Each structure stands twice: as C-alpha cells, then as structure tokens.
Design a protein around this motif. Structure first.
Motif, PDB file in Angstrom:
ATOM      1  N   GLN A  51      47.204  46.338  37.479  1.00 46.57           N
ATOM      2  CA  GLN A  51      45.698  45.901  38.286  1.00 46.57           C
ATOM      3  C   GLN A  51      45.923  45.625  38.891  1.00 46.57           C
ATOM      4  O   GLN A  51      45.517  45.469  40.039  1.00 46.57           O
ATOM      5  CB  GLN A  51      44.717  47.356  37.451  1.00 46.57           C
ATOM      6  N   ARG A  52      45.421  43.934  38.799  1.00 44.78           N
ATOM      7  CA  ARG A  52      45.651  43.088  38.889  1.00 44.78           C
ATOM      8  C   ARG A  52      45.772  42.944  39.890  1.00 44.78           C
ATOM      9  O   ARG A  52      45.840  42.264  41.520  1.00 44.78           O
ATOM     10  CB  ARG A  52      44.904  41.229  38.160  1.00 44.78           C
ATOM     11  N   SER A  80      30.911  43.243  31.043  1.00 47.13           N
ATOM     12  CA  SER A  80      30.524  43.650  31.630  1.00 47.13           C
ATOM     13  C   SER A  80      30.480  41.595  32.703  1.00 47.13           C
ATOM     14  O   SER A  80      29.826  41.008  31.863  1.00 47.13           O
ATOM     15  CB  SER A  80      28.734  44.257  31.073  1.00 47.13           C
ATOM     16  N   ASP A 128      37.015  37.089  44.125  1.00 50.27           N
ATOM     17  CA  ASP A 128      36.698  38.486  43.474  1.00 50.27           C
ATOM     18  C   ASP A 128      37.916  38.975  42.386  1.00 50.27           C
ATOM     19  O   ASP A 128      38.731  39.659  43.233  1.00 50.27           O
ATOM     20  CB  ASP A 128      36.094  39.512  44.207  1.00 50.27           C
ATOM     21  N   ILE A 129      37.721  39.209  41.146  1.00 50.03           N
ATOM     22  CA  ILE A 129      38.298  40.122  40.468  1.00 50.03           C
ATOM     23  C   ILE A 129      37.157  41.202  39.447  1.00 50.03           C
ATOM     24  O   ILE A 129      37.824  41.698  38.709  1.00 50.03           O
ATOM     25  CB  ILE A 129      39.291  39.888  38.771  1.00 50.03           C
ATOM     26  N   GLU A 130      36.863  41.543  40.151  1.00 54.06           N
ATOM     27  CA  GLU A 130      35.795  42.649  40.139  1.00 54.06           C
ATOM     28  C   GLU A 130      34.568  42.108  39.142  1.00 54.06           C
ATOM     29  O   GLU A 130      34.387  40.242  38.917  1.00 54.06           O
ATOM     30  CB  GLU A 130      35.956  44.278  39.848  1.00 54.06           C
ATOM     31  N   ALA A 165      46.541  44.494  43.760  1.00 53.64           N
ATOM     32  CA  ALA A 165      45.955  44.228  44.679  1.00 53.64           C
ATOM     33  C   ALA A 165      46.329  43.449  45.478  1.00 53.64           C
ATOM     34  O   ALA A 165      46.041  43.095  46.985  1.00 53.64           O
ATOM     35  CB  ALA A 165      44.200  43.534  43.971  1.00 53.64           C
ATOM     36  N   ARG A 223      30.417  41.146  37.000  1.00 51.23           N
ATOM     37  CA  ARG A 223      31.207  40.832  38.017  1.00 51.23           C
ATOM     38  C   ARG A 223      31.577  39.359  38.214  1.00 51.23           C
ATOM     39  O   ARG A 223      30.525  38.294  37.634  1.00 51.23           O
ATOM     40  CB  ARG A 223      30.742  40.506  39.212  1.00 51.23           C
ATOM     41  N   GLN A 275      33.977  35.705  40.514  1.00 47.46           N
ATOM     42  CA  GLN A 275      34.215  35.440  42.011  1.00 47.46           C
ATOM     43  C   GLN A 275      35.828  34.408  41.369  1.00 47.46           C
ATOM     44  O   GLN A 275      35.297  33.709  41.149  1.00 47.46           O
ATOM     45  CB  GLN A 275      32.679  34.465  42.761  1.00 47.46           C
TER      46      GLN A 275
END
Ligand SMILES: [Ca+2]
Ligand SMILES: [Ca+2]
Ligand SMILES: [Hg+2]
Length: 316
Positions: free
Chosen positions: A132-133, A59, A77-79, A136, A61, A63
C-alpha cells in the motif's frame, strides 16, 4: 510485577494490524517492544542516523522529508510501520520522519520485527502494508503493444506473486523471513517490470534483471509471458522498459539460461545479438544505450521516472 507484559499484549491485540490475534500470542512480542509517545513536531527518525529500531504506530500522522545540500527539504507524508527497511538492511536513514500530531505506538529492534514476521499470517500482512505504501509511488502507464492492444506497465509491487537469498550476504545473522521480506522491497539489485490487464488489473507478464551480486554490472534477465499473451509483442516491450531501468541503475550486461523448447524467450533474446549454447540453452548480451530503445522519448522519461520513484521509495 512483570505482568505489565500482559497489559501490553492486550494493547497490541487491540490494533487493526493484529486483528484476529489472541493477546496471549502477543506476549513474547510485547516483551520486545517499548511504548512510544511523541509530541507534535518531534523527530521520530533523523536522516543520517544508524537504523536501530522500527516503529508500529497506533495513531498519529507522520511526515517524511529528505534534506539535501542544494535546496529545501523534500516533504511527503505516510498518513502504520516506519523505519523497518533501513533497520533490516543495516543502512543509514535517508530521510527524516517527524510526528505531525501526537503519535502513539511501539518501538522494536530487528529481532522484534523478525518475531512479527514469524507469527501466523503476519508476514503477508506486513507485505500488504509495504505494498500500500509503494502503490502511492506507482502510476501505471498505458502502453500499446505491437498488435494494437492496450495494456499497463508498472514496476512490480510487494506481494505480486510475479516477484518470486542471493545478494543478501550483506545482512548479518539473518533468517529466511528477514531476507524474504527484504526481497519484496528490493528494486536496485533486482528490478521487475510488470504488464497488467487494466490499470488495477492482473499481471499478465513480467520481466526482470537480477544482479549477479550487490551492485554488480552483470545481471541475469528473465521474461515471463502469460500463455495467452505470447506473439503479441508484450515481451519485447517489457525488454525495452528493462533497458531504461538497467541503464538507469548501472547494469551493463544481461545474461539468460532457458529450456530449449521455450522458443518465445529465445526470440526475445535473439532480438539483440543472442548466441545460445547447450547445457537448457545459455547466452549473454551487452546493455544498449537509452538512445536505442524503440519508444518515444516521452515514454522513456515516464519509465525512468517510474524507476527512480520506486527506488527512492525503498531507500535505494
Ligand atoms: Ca498500482
Ligand atoms: Ca546487518
Ligand atoms: Hg497473531
């Protein structure tokens, strides 16, 4: 007592990442990971450091930023997984990652990552995360082929079956899994363009160059067009895209080897100076200037922008 491994494995098995995993199966991995708890603003990975670990984030976020000598840092940012590409390549960190919130997770070395890569099902899950990364960083481009049909051009993504131990003589004591994972995130030594049906649709053709070696100026090209899609101009279109990238990355000559009754690849290659020789036929050609690709300058720039964006996203 060393049953803290047992508490650790259950903690790992509670992650979405390891859904469906039995905690006992994670005990050997638990042994190789160290808990991570970073406070907001804490540097997780510093640009310019050697790559010693990767992180699996429970957990918080983070940056990403890249600092330069000519203006302020470029921030993103990668969330879930951080740091693993430079770790497996043994390349220095090209960007800094900072906790933007409390960040809790686990840190491991290359051996720990190879353990994950060999657990059942987990190689593909790691590849979906990488995918997924990267998605983006990809905006598919609507392109009109010779016939007037509209299709979409994008770089390949990790997990596209179209993607599939040559250039990777730069990785010490590797396993096949480590090399296969790197293959999915290589854009510099092996660049693949893909044409899809719809922006989020199936790949119906691909073209690639594969450098003879790391950073080499000669590359083997190879176009593949879905049986329905030949004649339609898709192949020669992908070829244009490949010159833009090849030119952009430094590749200077292309070469081909094909089965002889494969006339459609032959015609793609005949389209610039191709002179075949039996073996299976062979041939090898120069890399023409970006000036000379039959695309609008607008299309050319979007292709070079796409090329640049994905190569940087993979730290190349
Ligand atoms: Ca996409
Ligand atoms: Ca190495
Ligand atoms: Hg598992």
């Amino acid at each position: 007592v060393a049953e803290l491994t047992e508490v650790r494995a259950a903690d790992l098995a509670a992650l979405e990442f390891f859904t469906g995993c039995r905690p006992s199966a994670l005990e050997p991995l638990a042994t190789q990971l160290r808990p991570l708890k970073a406070e907001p603003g804490q540097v997780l990975i510093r640009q310019g450091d050697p790559a010693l670990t990767f992180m699996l984030i429970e957990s918080g976020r983070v940056q990403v930023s890249h600092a330069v000598a000519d203006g302020p840092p470029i921030v993103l940012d990668i969330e879930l997984i951080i740091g693993e590409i430079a770790l497996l390549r043994d390349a220095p960190r090209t960007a800094t990652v900072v906790a933007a919130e409390p960040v809790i997770g686990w840190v491991g070395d290359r051996d720990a990552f190879d353990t994950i890569l060999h657990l059942p099902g987990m190689f593909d899950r790691l590849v979906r995360i990488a995918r997924q990364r990267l998605a983006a960083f990809i905006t598919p481009i609507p392109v009109q082929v010779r016939t007037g049909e509209w299709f979409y051009l994008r770089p390949v993504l990790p997990g596209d079956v179209e993607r599939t131990y040559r250039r990777f003589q730069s990785v010490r004591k590797p396993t096949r899994a480590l090399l296969e994972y790197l293959f999915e995130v290589d854009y510099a030594d092996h660049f693949v363009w893909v044409m899809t049906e719809g922006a989020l649709g199936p790949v119906i053709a691909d073209a690639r160059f594969v450098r003879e070696g790391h950073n080499a100026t000669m590359a083997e090209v190879a176009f593949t067009v879905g049986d329905d899609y030949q004649g339609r101009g898709i192949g020669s279109f992908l070829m244009g895209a490949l010159i833009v990238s090849a030119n952009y990355v430094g590749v200077q000559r292309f070469n081909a080897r094909v089965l002889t009754d494969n006339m459609a690849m032959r015609k793609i290659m005949d389209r610039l100076g191709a002179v075949w020789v039996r073996e299976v036929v062979m041939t090898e050609v120069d890399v023409p200037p970006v000036d000379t690709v039959p695309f609008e300058p607008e299309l050319i720039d979007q292709i070079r922008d796409a090329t640049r964006k994905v190569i940087r996203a993979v730290s190349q």
